[PDB]
């Protein structure tokens, strides 16, 4: 049934969910949507209809042949206005993955791609100053780290839009992205055209990187650093006299070096402070509605209670924190509004990189937090909890270790933010 | 349309731009030129005409077959008086790169090659004395480092012209260059003739290097050190009893060793101070017009303002600095005249190389700046800012870290230059 798939994709585009999960059991099938990170239950339908939608989704993709069969792992992709019937204009590509599930069941996951105040998107002012400092530098490599849900592409787009204006259009910027999802002024995104099979995608990505290096690159923005060859090419370009802005998957701002050593980057490449200009780690959390703004007493009287760690976090400022209001008001659909970025930005020095390269993780963290006046993800999350922008539960679900901050550090951060 | 291409190349030769960029969108195409490093907007035309010029440029190259197709990365080269119709005599070769850009768009970059007081080309007198000292030495390897825009080939040409006169024509000099772009007296440039495909160019370069080594080389000037095999051959020739002058791509004068270790040079080759005779890092900046010479007060009254870091740099000498005059006077076309070299020259010792090999970057830099009386790029840029030759904005765009110089170092440099 193509009509059911059309309405399902229309609903997914209208509510702007990220990924769509369909689990088909022997009796009934469940539909889940990943909207703003959290997963919600959309609908529950019969198994035969869901099997029909899954077959229609697989048959309409660009992976024709290797027909739809149960108990098989199958990957596919649907391109808008290119793959048979048309798609909503907000969606460019849908990546489909089919997994077996039990006996007589299926598991489909569709990852949608969307076409889609400039100074701060929830950043701290220290992060903005650090961003300006790294934008002023003409030579170096910058790595943006975080999960797939965080706003890395938007951050890079905004940084390059600011940098193009700041340079008075006297510099050339070249970006390499396999999907040209975000339009950036004066950047000339280079797509990957002859992708062919999935195994040949990396070779064409390397070819695009080398072609961009044979150009006048100056500033380079690859979409993602995935394998060792692309990272080696980027590090070679960084020691040549080019500026590189890249995205990486990592758990921490200081854990970027672990990923680079996993890929194969040598120690003398990571030792230079002039090369590795900046490291950014990002997470996205939900912003509480500023109009409802119920307090801790109202949340306790309504129902529910906080745990011991949440109480320990709250204990510094009781009345300053706010909690979500599930009253279904007209101002907020669910009370969670949009989303904010919690981030940490590090500008390395010689001593910090020497401490990192020697394996002294605790010493390097102490040097960054004390001598360099740094701020981690947990401290920014605690500050946003105290300010009342976000809830404690979402922060402790996204970031761990908020309760481990000492009282002296909390007082120092509060005094530093109140003085400025 | 071949006529439009002919006038475009005539304009590019007449204004002597370095590279030419053409970006073709769905509606209109933009033409950019890289003149004196900065990029300027030449013209805006329609998409069909620009596509016609791009097709005519690709078809007239030496890469016939593999016809001009959209969404494909294509490399080509045009040789003057050899590739079908003739070219201006000032241009030898034009390297063409074609990249996809969006849907129904293209991106062409053409890199022109040109045919093209002897003691200083903007150098400091310490750099001239160091150059004389390295020219007097009969055995060693010298590496010139910098970006592709800096004047490395001209510096090597001038150094070899001075050295041939200083040696009273009692020595043999052999140079290896793939383009024989610069004519040097008594040097006998060896070109690469049977280049065939682009992948076979390195093998013929190695063959030319080995043929030059089978000659009486004495002093050798390869065009560029690109791969590990050529660098290994040059290091083998340096330990044999030959003098090597080479060009390398690097970010810093002391960062040459990082590139050499990346290529595969062992530690005992880099430890010897008698082998690595000198290291030079070069940048090119724009020279302010000496006739207009407006001050800081005139620049402030005309419009615009300097930032906090620029004010911190200026604060030592307010009236000594000068700013560009955009009055469109008859003496200067744009107020930026020609270009000057900001460079750093290091003559290594045993202790400095031992500190570099042990990974002590800060200790090696301190030893070079204090014990060896060295001068970095930032200090030379600051001295040229104070003298009034160049503007602070161009220097801070080209070189970072000018504001990090301490007041004691600034006073020491000013007193040292005023005493001599
Ligand atoms: N303040 C915000 N900052 C970043 N992203 C936001 C923000 N608010 C909403 N979003 C949404 O987060 C989503 C994910 O960001 P994205 O640019 O796609 O990064 P990534 O490529 O790593 O997934 C975006 O679609 C964006 O619309
Ligand atoms: N004082 C100067 N020193 C060096 N180059 C200069 C100077 N003034 C103008 N130029 C120009 O800089 C351009 C680049 O120098 P070049 O010899 O080509 O080095 P490279 O081979 O690394 O590009 C030259 O074409 C030269 O005409
Ligand atoms: Mg992304
Ligand atoms: Mg050269
Ligand atoms: Zn509300
Ligand atoms: Zn003038």
Author numbering:
A (entry chain A), B (entry chain B): 107 to 222, 231 to 534
Quote the passages of the study that discuss this structure, keeping the authors' original sentences.
Type 4 pili (T4P) are retractable surface appendages found on numerous bacteria and archaea that play essential roles in various microbial functions, including host colonization by pathogens.
After confirming structural integrity of the sample, cryo-EM and high-throughput data collection yielded 7,207 good movies and 313,223 good particles for BfpD-ADP. Additionally, in the BfpD-ADP map, Mg2+ is seen between Ser267 (from the Walker A motif) and the beta-phosphate of ADP. The loop (294-310) carrying the catalytic Glu295 has a well-defined cryo-EM density and is positioned closer to the nucleotide in BfpD-ADP compared to BfpD-ANP, assisted by a hydrogen bond between ADP and Tyr296. Comparison of the BfpD-ADP and BfpD-ANP structures reveals a subtle outward shift in position of the N2D with respect to the CTD such that the mobile innermost N2D loops delineate a circle of 65 Å in diameter (distance between diagonally located Ala172 residues) in the presence of ADP, and 70–73 Å diameter in the presence of ANP class 1 and 2, respectively. This change is accompanied by a slight change in angle of 1.1° for the N2D and 1.6° for the CTD between each monomer and the vertical axis for the BfpD-ANP structure compared to the BfpD-ADP structure, which is consistent with the outward shift in the center of mass described in the much lower resolution TtPilB cryo-EM structure. Transition from BfpD-ADP to BfpD-ANP resulted in a slight outward shift of the top part of the toroid, a tendency more pronounced in BfpD-ANP class 2. Top and side view: As a result of N2D twisting in each of the six subunits, the BfpD ring contracts during the transition from ANP class-2 to ADP and vice versa. The ring closure represents an event of ATP-bound BfpD, progressing to the post-ATP hydrolysis state (ADP).
